[PDB]
Amino acid sequence: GASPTEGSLTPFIHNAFKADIQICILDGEMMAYNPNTQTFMQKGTKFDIKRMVEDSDLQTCYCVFDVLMVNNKKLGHETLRKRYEILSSIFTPIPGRIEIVQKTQAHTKNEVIDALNEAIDKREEGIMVKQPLSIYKPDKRGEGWLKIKP
DNA sequence: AAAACTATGCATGCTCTACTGCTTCTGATCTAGTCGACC
C-alpha cells in the first residue's frame, strides 16, 4: 500500500508515527506474524511473505533496525548509537504491525556464546553483532555489521 | 331413346414441415509446467 486508504501493512500503521515526524526513511525486515499464538512464523514452509494469500490469518510485521532521515535531517553519517536513539523517538510500537528490534549491550565473549545458545534454543538462525560507532555505508559488506550462526 | 356437358372421387406428382442420427465447434475442468523474486 502506497496510501493509508488501501494497503496490506500501511493502512494500519498510518497513525503509528509521532506527530512531529513528517519525512522519514527506515530500513528493516518484513516477516509473517501468527496472532492466535502471538508468534513469528519462521521463513520457509507454508508461507512466503512476498506473495501472501489474502485469506490466510497470518499478517505482515515490520521490524525496524535503522533510520536514515527524519525531518530533512541526514542521519547517514552519524554513529549507530545516535541513529538508534533517534529511532526510539519516531513511532510508538504497536505489536503485530510495526516493532523495533531489541539490541543488548555486551562486552564479553561469554555473552555472545550465551546469546547464540539461547537463539538456537528458540530455533532461530543465529545472532548478529553491531559496532556502536559504525557508519552506514550503502552496498558495502562487513564494515560494522557481523553475523554468527552455529 | 341417344348424344353432349358437367360433377365428383381417386390416382399421381410435386413441395413443404417434424423427428432421429452423425459430425464438429465451444466451454469448463483438471493436471503439468514456467516465470519472479527472495533467502
UniProtKB/Swiss-Prot annotation:
Chain residues that bind Mg(2+) 1: E29
Tissue specificity field: Testis, thymus, prostate and heart.
Residues the record lists as binding Mg(2+) 2: E125
Chain residues that bind ATP: E29, K43, F65, E125, K130, K147, K149
Localization per record: Nucleus
Oligomeric and partner information: Interacts with XRCC4; the LIG4-XRCC4 subcomplex has a 1:2 stoichiometry and XRCC4 is required for LIG4 stability. Component of the core long-range non-homologous end joining (NHEJ) complex (also named DNA-PK complex) composed of PRKDC, LIG4, XRCC4, XRCC6/Ku70, XRCC5/Ku86 and NHEJ1/XLF. Additional component of the NHEJ complex includes PAXX. Following autophosphorylation, PRKDC dissociates from DNA, leading to formation of the short-range NHEJ complex, composed of LIG4, XRCC4, XRCC6/Ku70, XRCC5/Ku86 and NHEJ1/XLF. Interacts with DCLRE1C; the interaction is direct. Interacts with APLF.
Biological function: DNA ligase involved in DNA non-homologous end joining (NHEJ); required for double-strand break (DSB) repair and V(D)J recombination. Catalyzes the NHEJ ligation step of the broken DNA during DSB repair by resealing the DNA breaks after the gap filling is completed. Joins single-strand breaks in a double-stranded polydeoxynucleotide in an ATP-dependent reaction. LIG4 is mechanistically flexible: it can ligate nicks as well as compatible DNA overhangs alone, while in the presence of XRCC4, it can ligate ends with 2-nucleotides (nt) microhomology and 1-nt gaps.
Known disease link: LIG4 syndrome: Characterized by immunodeficiency and developmental and growth delay. Patients display unusual facial features, microcephaly, growth and/or developmental delay, pancytopenia, and various skin abnormalities.
Similarity comment: family membership: Belongs to the ATP-dependent DNA ligase family.
Protein name, as recorded: DNA ligase 4
Organism of origin: Homo sapiens (Human)
Parent-record interval covered: 303 to 452 of 911
